[PDB]
Structure 1
Amino acid sequence: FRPENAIKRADELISVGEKQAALQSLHDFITARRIRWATPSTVEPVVFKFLEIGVELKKGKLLKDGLHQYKKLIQGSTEGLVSVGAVARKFIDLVESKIASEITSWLRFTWESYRAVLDLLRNNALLEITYSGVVKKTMHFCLKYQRKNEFKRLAEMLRQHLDAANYQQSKSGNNLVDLSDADTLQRYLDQRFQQVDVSVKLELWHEAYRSIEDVFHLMKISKRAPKPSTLANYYENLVKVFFVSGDPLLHTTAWKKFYKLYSTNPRATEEEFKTYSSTIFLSAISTQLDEIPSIGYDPHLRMYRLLNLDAKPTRKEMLQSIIEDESIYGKVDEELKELYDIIEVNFDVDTVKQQLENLLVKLSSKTYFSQYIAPLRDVIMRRVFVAASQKFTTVSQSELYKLATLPAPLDLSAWDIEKSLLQAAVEDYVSITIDHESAKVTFA
């Protein structure tokens, strides 16, 4: 019949308190078999009314069924797909106004709404823009309401979506997503870039880590480069991830990738180049000694390829690739260069406590130095134990342990020191026999 008549009958049915009968009346109209031929433009207002009522009554299933059934009828024309996307947007704007007005079941309703719209707009060339919009809105929603569980499921949904796109690539059907086109990719990559950001901000490190692989695969296929802003943010997220992760070589790498990209910004102060360069160098000195093959087991081995590295580097290699690169080594604080001399170049155990004692007063004031104190200490002490292994045959525990006591803030209690000595022995940086009877240590 007529849309005006439909709206009227709805408005009348709400006055009698038959709200559900009104929603159900509109559903019938817009999912009617005659809608396939109707002008999308002139039925869309009824779909809008259907959405208005459906949101108030929180009838999520009927809304979903309404949209899907309507789209199947209408998606034949270009104007049809346009109406679909427009009705998707209307739905989202309606529920998004309800969160503004409002509540637990309202958040879940909102999630289910975002989810439904995304699953409705999935893998359609004409709806790529609206979908990419809803993805961004959905990720902003999860971060804004710390909905970590739903976020994890969202991420999985986006993965399944892309898997279907890839399967459909070799099908040449109309209105199918073309993963060959850079604009399509620019959006998909932007979504995955944002997926990583929210992951990091919600401290879901396992999910952050999975999304790095998601992003990488899109960067591979992508011909067109991303915005240097959004890419710089990405690398800045990787520095966070790999620090939490305990992969220090990857951490330095993410920093270098970020430094190399930030040195091409017009608004980049010299004070920043000072502190960033310093951070990068310290984190490379602060890296665990790989001067001996690992125990060894490493579940993060695949990640080197994900950071575009052909293979796992050494700390010596990384540290040299930092010293040689003048763009970085140039703006590095002097204290760190001296440190590098003291620990890596000319290491003398008989003088290291002193060198460090004179250098740490200046180093402690540095902002970045605070967060690398532990691993650095570990490195220095490892070196001290190795060199001590070279210096003694049977040394008193008193002598050895005090000789391995760095100055603050690298200081350690005597028992934590023996603890380090044994760890070095387990990793075979030294073989020892400790006689607790005599309070002596023998390197045999």
Structure 2
Amino acid sequence: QYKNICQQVNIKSLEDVVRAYLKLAEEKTEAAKEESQQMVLDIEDLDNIQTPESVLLSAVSGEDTQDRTDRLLLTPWVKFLWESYRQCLDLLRNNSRVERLYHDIAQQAFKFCLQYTRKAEFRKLCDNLRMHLSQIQRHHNQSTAINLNNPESQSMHLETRLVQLDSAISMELWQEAFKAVEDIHGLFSLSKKPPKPQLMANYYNKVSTVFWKSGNALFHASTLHRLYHLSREMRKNLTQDEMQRMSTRVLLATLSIPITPERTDIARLLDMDGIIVEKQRRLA
């Protein structure tokens, strides 16, 4: 109702209202955890810790008392917040015209996922992808007149990126990171009409790093050299008067390089056989 009446009129109201809403809900969950995590958590393991009479029997398929009673007094807050974030900006602003705030919302969601449950990531990520698809493959409304408006574009881009990257490389997720990279690639494909602004180098380095281990230091070292080359362009444009930087760069390069001289394709040597090469080409 509020967005409607406050439509092609005044948005300053919506910004103040919806920020104050999510801020009130965040404080209820802050209080709800502390409450359960200081008073009720100490009430739980309170006193001794030997013999539960019926605590040992369920020890064959149970957990700790803090999770067992934090579910009674914190899960509510978390759940509520999650639902709100999902239906809030999402089910009320999966697009529109201007008004960023979206970035802040995304950041909040990411933080929540990191802290509380992680499953939320799958839901949030899914919703985001769906929204990006509706627009990118939608185009049918007085929405954003895409063309040469790299502002909002670059913004959202970097946003999701950093959020996705760290997100996955935080809660030990990986499929999420993969999806994020795929999305970024798609954006670049449909967003290659512009020369190229900053952040590029940033993201590149970040990714190469996050990689390093998982994949072999081969592709990782390749991405490292890519970031090194980016430091050259950014240099001519970025201008970085520091020798230490160059040193570190060369070092990273070397390592990522000398590391593996051959791969042990056991799975392949077994089954025939991939279904395991074109994927490498895709990574390339």
Q: Report TM bin, short chain.
A: 0.5 to 0.7
Structure 2 equivalent of residue 125 of structure 1? 97
Task: Specify the SS of the correspondent of 1:148.
Answer: coil
Determine which of 64, 87, 91 is the counterpart of 2:17: 87
Measure, in 1, the Cα distance between the counterparts of 2:82 and 2:220: 34
Measure, in 1, the Cα distance between the counterparts of 2:125 and 2:212: 20
Structure 1 equivalent of residue 52 of structure 2? none
Q: Per-residue deviation at 1:200?
A: 1.3
Q: In structure 2, what residue type is equivalent to 1:280?
A: A
Structure 2 equivalent of residue 185 of structure 1? 153
Q: Per-residue deviation at 1:259?
A: 2.0
TM-score by length of 1: 0.45
Q: 1:261 to 1:109 in 2, by over 3 A?
A: same
Instruction: Kindly name which structure, 1 or 2, has the bigger radius of gyration based on alpha carbons.
Output: 1
Determine which of 237, 259, 262 is the counterpart of 1:286: 259
Kindly indicate whether residue 249 of structure 2 is the aligned counterpart of residue 276 of structure 1. yes
Tell me, which stretches of 5 or more residues in structure 2 are unaligned?
33-73
Q: 1:221 to 1:82 in 2, by over 3 A?
A: farther
**Identity percentage of aligned residues:** 23
Measure, in 1, the Cα distance between the counterparts of 2:256 and 2:101: 43
Task: Specify the SS of the correspondent of 1:152.
Answer: helix
Instruction: Answer yes or no: is the 8 Å Cα contact 1:118–1:134 preserved in 2.
Output: yes
Q: RCO (CA 8 Å, sep 6+): is it higher in 1 or 2?
A: 2
Q: Per-residue deviation at 1:270?
A: 3.0
Measure, in 1, the Cα distance between the counterparts of 2:184 and 2:24: 32
Measure, in 1, the Cα distance between the counterparts of 2:116 and 2:201: 24
Measure, in 2, the Cα distance between the counterparts of 1:162 and 1:278: 39
RMSD over aligned CA atoms reads 3.0
Measure, in 2, the Cα distance between the counterparts of 1:108 and 1:286: 45
Instruction: Answer yes or no: is the 8 Å Cα contact 2:85–2:109 preserved in 1.
Output: yes
Instruction: Answer yes or no: is the 8 Å Cα contact 2:168–2:174 preserved in 1.
Output: yes
What does residue range 342-421 of structure 1 map to in structure 2 within 5 Å? none
Measure, in 1, the Cα distance between the counterparts of 2:282 and 2:124: 26
Q: 1:183 to 1:240 in 2, by over 3 A?
A: same
How many residues align? The count is 228
Determine which of 74, 82, 105 is the counterpart of 2:5: 74
Q: Per-residue deviation at 1:131?
A: 1.6
Q: 1:76 to 1:276 in 2, by over 3 A?
A: closer
Instruction: Answer yes or no: is the 8 Å Cα contact 2:94–2:131 preserved in 1.
Output: yes
Structure 1 equivalent of residue 77 of structure 2? 106
CA deviations on 1:251-286 (whole Å, 9 max, x unpaired) are 112211222334536567534432432332232232
Q: In structure 2, what residue type is equivalent to 1:182?
A: N
TM-score by length of 2: 0.68
Q: In structure 2, what residue type is equivalent to 1:77?
A: Q
Task: Specify the SS of the correspondent of 2:196.
Answer: coil
Determine which of 148, 152, 157 is the counterpart of 2:127: 157
Measure, in 2, the Cα distance between the counterparts of 1:109 and 1:255: 42
Q: In structure 2, what residue type is equivalent to 1:178?
A: A
Structure 2 equivalent of residue 3 of structure 1? none
Instruction: Answer yes or no: is the 8 Å Cα contact 2:204–2:223 preserved in 1.
Output: no
Task: Specify the SS of the correspondent of 1:287.
Answer: coil
